[PDB]
Amino acid sequence: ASMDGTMRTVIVQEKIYWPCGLSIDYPNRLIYFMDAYLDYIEFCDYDGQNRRQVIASDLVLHHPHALTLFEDSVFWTDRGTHQ
Amino acid sequence: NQDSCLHFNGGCTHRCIQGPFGATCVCPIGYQLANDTKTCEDVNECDIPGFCSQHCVNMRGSFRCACDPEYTLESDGRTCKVTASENLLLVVASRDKIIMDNITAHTHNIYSLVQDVSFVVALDFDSVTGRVFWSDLLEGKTWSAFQNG
Amino acid sequence: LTGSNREVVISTAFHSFGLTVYGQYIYWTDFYTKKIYRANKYDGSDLIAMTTRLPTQPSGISTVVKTQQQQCSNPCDQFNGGC
Ligand SMILES: *[C@@H]1O[C@H](CO)[C@@H](O)[C@H](O)[C@H]1NC(C)=O
Ligand SMILES: *[C@@H]1O[C@H](CO)[C@@H](O)[C@H](O)[C@H]1NC(C)=O
Numbered sequence: 001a002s003m004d005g006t007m008r009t010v011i012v013q014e015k016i017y018w019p020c021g022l023s024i025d026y027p028n029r030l031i032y033f034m035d036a037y038l039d040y041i042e043f044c045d046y047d048g049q050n051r052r053q054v055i056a057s058d059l060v061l062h063h064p065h066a067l068t069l070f071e072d073s074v075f076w077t078d079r080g081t082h083q
Numbered sequence: 084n085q086d087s088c089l090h091f092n093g094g095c096t097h098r099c100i101q102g103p104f105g106a107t108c109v110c111p112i113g114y115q116l117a118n119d120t121k122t123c124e125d126v127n128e129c130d131i132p133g134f135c136s137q138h139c140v141n142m143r144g145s146f147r148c149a150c151d152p153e154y155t156l157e158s159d160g161r162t163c164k165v166t167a168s169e170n171l172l173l174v175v176a177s178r179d180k181i182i183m184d185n186i187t188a189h190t191h192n193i194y195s196l197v198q199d200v201s202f203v204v205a206l207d208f209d210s211v212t213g214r215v216f217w218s219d220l221l222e223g224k225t226w227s228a229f230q231n232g
Numbered sequence: 233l234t235g236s237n238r239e240v241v242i243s244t245a246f247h248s249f250g251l252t253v254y255g256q257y258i259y260w261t262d263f264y265t266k267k268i269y270r271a272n273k274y275d276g277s278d279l280i281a282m283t284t285r286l287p288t289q290p291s292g293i294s295t296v297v298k299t300q301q302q303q304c305s306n307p308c309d310q311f312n313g314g315c
């Protein structure tokens with residue numbers, strides 16, 4: 001949406017079940033989003049028309065909650081592993 | 084294949100070389116050769132996710148990369164690094180403790196910032212005031228403090 | 233077979249006990265999740281669980297195949313190899 005709520009759109013609508021946390025990469029203008037049922041970390045573009053998987057089909061993720069970014073590194077927290 | 088490699092470059096775009104099967108064809112660094120085994124094509128390096136960190140422009144057999152003003156490009160041609168001298172500071176929320184970690188050349192230092200926090204859930208920071216904001220679920224409140232507690 | 237190269241195919245395997253390989257896939261069973269898992273033996277590219285949570289801790293796994301195995305002559309089959 002617009003930061004005043006005047007425009008609203010849905011950008012990720014499929015292959016999504018319990019989307020927990022969001023983070024933004026400003027140089028690339030990318031949105032980073034994380035899912036706790038399908039257990040993935042993905043990044044897409046502001047319109048949701050380019051989409052990619054960072055961690056997927058990996059047992060490292062149990063119940064992710066929150067996400068942050070720095071340089072070429074992504075940090076997250078997991079409630080199942082307490083990690 | 085074609086012995087006429089010698090006569091007409093084998094119809095190949097860049098270069099043909101003689102061999103036991105008549106023709107062999109090669110494209111230089113950054114290029115790619117395809118199903119016809121004769122033409123040359125350019126690797127669109129920017130199509131690889133994360134080839135270079137921030138901005139990428141494809142060129143014939145080459146690439147160009149750029150970083151935003153907060154960042155300086157490194158000598159290799161792909162990596163970007165941060166100009167600010169301050170260490171990375173990483174803040175995590177546990178119910179009784181706002182944990183803070185300080186990063187120095189891939190070494191860690193972990194401590195607990197603020198006293199008397201009940202159940203912290205959400206965190207953010209403001210760079211103008213140099214402050215950290217958090218919310219407490221048992222208190223039903225939002226608090227702000229300095230990065231030194 | 234000599235140790236010349238070493239690689240990690242699956243980076244997290246929740247206390248695997250038993251292991252087998254067939255086709256493009258590697259299968260293993262673990263105690264922690266009480267499950268049998270399938271992965272791709274070159275990359276861990278596609279990871280799935282072949283079973284639901286089983287009622288008890290699973291155990292070792294093996295394969296049944298109709299095709300005849302690799303065959304070779306046995307030195308022991310002539311006069312017990314002298315033994
Ligand atoms: C080259 O062959 C592969 C395999 O058949 C095919 O996937 C690809 O589309 C072909 N490319 C061209 C340019 O013909
Ligand atoms: C982080 O560590 C550096 C190096 O010891 C120090 O100068 C700086 O004050 C520390 N910052 C915080 C917020 O702990």
Ligand SMILES: *[C@@H]1O[C@H](CO)[C@@H](O)[C@H](O)[C@H]1NC(C)=O
Pocket residue numbers: 213229230231
């Ligand atoms: C904490 O940081 C603020 C802002 O830089 C500063 O004004 C204050 O003196 C600091 N206090 C301590 C005890 O370091």
Ligand SMILES: [Ca+2]
Pocket residue numbers: 036037038039061062063
């Ligand atoms: Ca999960």
Ligand SMILES: [Ca+2]
Pocket residue numbers: 113125126127128141142143144145146
């Ligand atoms: Ca190129």
